Write a protein that binds this ligand. Structure first.
Ligand code: SAH
Lengths: 14, 217
C-alpha cells in the first residue's frame, strides 16, 4: 500500500 | 536569518569509531550498503529526473552560506568526523537514533540518502523508510528516496505519533527539502538543543500524510 515519509519544500526550518 | 549550523563531532576518536560501528551494525542487520549520497540505479529514476523546478509550487533554494555548511559537514563525514549519533535497538521502536553528544538548535544532522526512484515504481513497495524527494504536477514525474539497499543514518531516525495529544512534544528535529544546484535534496536539522542520550524524532508527515503513525510510541 506504500507508506511514505514527506517534508515541506517551503517555509524553511524555523 | 536562521543559519544552518555544522555539527560538533565527538572529541574522543574512540567515541567516533563506536558511533560509526553502531551504524555499520544496523546496516548489516538490514543487509544494506552505506551510502552518504543520493544514488541513481538502473530500472529506477535517472539523475536527469531530479530537478527542483518540477516541484509543484516550487522549492526553496539552499543559500551559498548554507551550501558551504552542508559541504563542510559532508567533508567532515569523509574524514571520519561523523555527527555525534548512536544507532540503538529499542524493542518498541526497532532501530532508533540518539544523540551521543550535544546537538544545538539549527544544527545539520544528515541528508536523507538512498536510491532515487519514481513514486509510480514504488506504489506496491513494502519498504518502511521511503521519503518523498520531488512532488510534481504530473505524478509519473514524482520521486521517492528508497534506502532499502543503500542508505545512511537518516533512515533509522524515529517519527512522532501524529494522533496523540502529547506526541508532538517529542519532536526535536525537522526534515526539509531544498534545491541545491537545481536538484531536490532532503535534510534533517535540529529544531531545539538536544542533550546526549536524547532520542531523535521528526514529523514523518511533514507535507503529505502518507505515513501511518497511530501505533507509534
Ligand atoms: N515513535 C515510534 N514508535 C514506534 N515505532 C516507530 C516510531 N518511529 C518509527 N518507528 C518504526 O520505524 C519505522 C520507520 S523507519 C525507522 C527505522 C526503523 N525503526 C528500523 O528498525 O529500521 C516505522 O514503520 C516503525 O516501525
Amino acid at each position: 500500500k506504500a507508506a511514505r515519509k514527506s517534508a515541506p519544500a517551503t517555509g524553511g526550518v524555523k | 536569518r536562521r543559519r544552518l549550523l555544522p555539527f560538533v563531532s565527538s572529541e574522543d576518536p574512540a567515541q567516533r569509531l563506536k558511533q560509526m560501528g553502531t551504524l555499520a551494525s544496523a546496516l548489516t542487520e538490514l543487509q544494506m550498503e552505506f551510502s552518504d549520497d543520493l544514488t541513481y540505479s538502473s530500472g529506477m529514476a535517472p539523475r536527469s529526473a531530479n530537478q527542483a523546478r518540477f516541484e509543484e509550487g516550487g522549492m526553496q533554494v539552499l543559500t551559498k552560506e548554507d551550501i558551504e555548511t552542508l559541504e563542510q559537514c559532508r567533508a567532515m563525514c569523509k574524514r571520519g568526523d561523523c555527527p555525534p549519533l548512536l544507532v540503538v535497538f529499542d524493542s518498541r521502536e526497532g532501530f532508533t537514533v540518539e544523540a551521543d553528544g550535544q546537538i544545538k538548535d539549527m544544527t545539520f544532522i544528515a541528508e536523507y540518502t538512498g536510491d532515487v526512484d519514481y513514486i509510480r515504481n514504488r506504489e506496491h513497495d513494502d519498504c518502511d523508510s521511503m521519503m518523498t524527494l520531488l512532488l510534481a504536477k504530473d505524478p509519473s514525474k514524482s520521486l521517492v528516496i528508497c534506502p532499502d539497499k543503500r542508505g545512511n543514518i537518516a533512515r533509522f531516525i524515529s517519527g512522532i505519533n501524529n494522533h496523540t495529544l502529547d506526541g508532538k512534544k517529542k519532536q526535536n528535529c525537522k526534515c526539509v527539502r531544498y534545491s541545491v544546484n537545481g536538484e531536490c535534496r532532503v535534510f534533517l536539522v535540529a529544531t531545539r538543543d538536544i542533550a546526549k542520550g536524547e532520542r531523535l524524532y521528526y514529523d514523518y508527515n511533514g507535507y503529505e500524510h502518507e505515513y501511518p503513525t497511530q501505533h507509534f510510541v
